[PDB]
């Protein structure tokens, strides 16, 4: 559906037993960087002297027009990453019907 305008509000990445990876969100003007470093505070997995692997969902803001938002994942570390899936939410509106 490209007829209407979709204003993206937020996206998420689903990961399981993954190390750090950086999420870059770029629009026509600005760019943003979001890091899924690994496990969360208080998690049994997050320990000192042990490899930091996170499992779950990381929600990050992707703001603006969907047609002009570039999201890519970069990672150059020695930790593994396992991206299960992704998803997005946004405010969509079209002034005409599909007919």
């Amino acid at each position: 559906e490209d007829i209407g305008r979709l204003q993206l509000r937020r996206a998420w990445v689903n990961y399981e037993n993954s190390g750090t990876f950086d999420i870059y969100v770029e629009n026509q003007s600005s760019n943003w960087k979001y890091t899924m470093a690994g496990a969360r505070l208080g998690s049994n997995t997050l320990r000192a002297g042990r490899l930091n692997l996170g499992t779950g969902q990381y929600r990050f803001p992707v703001v603006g027009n969907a047609k002009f938002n570039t999201v890519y994942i970069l990672s150059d570390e020695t930790t593994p990453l396992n991206i299960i899936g992704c998803g997005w939410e946004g405010n969509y509106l079209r002034r005409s019907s599909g007919i």
Binding site: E1, I3, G4, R94, R95, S96, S97, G98, I99
Partner: peptide, 15 residues
């Protein structure tokens, strides 16, 4: 909420 475009795989040739 206006209706969405119906997903039409459509086709080709003579109809």
């Amino acid at each position: 909420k206006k209706s969405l475009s119906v997903a039409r795989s459509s086709g080709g040739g003579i109809n």
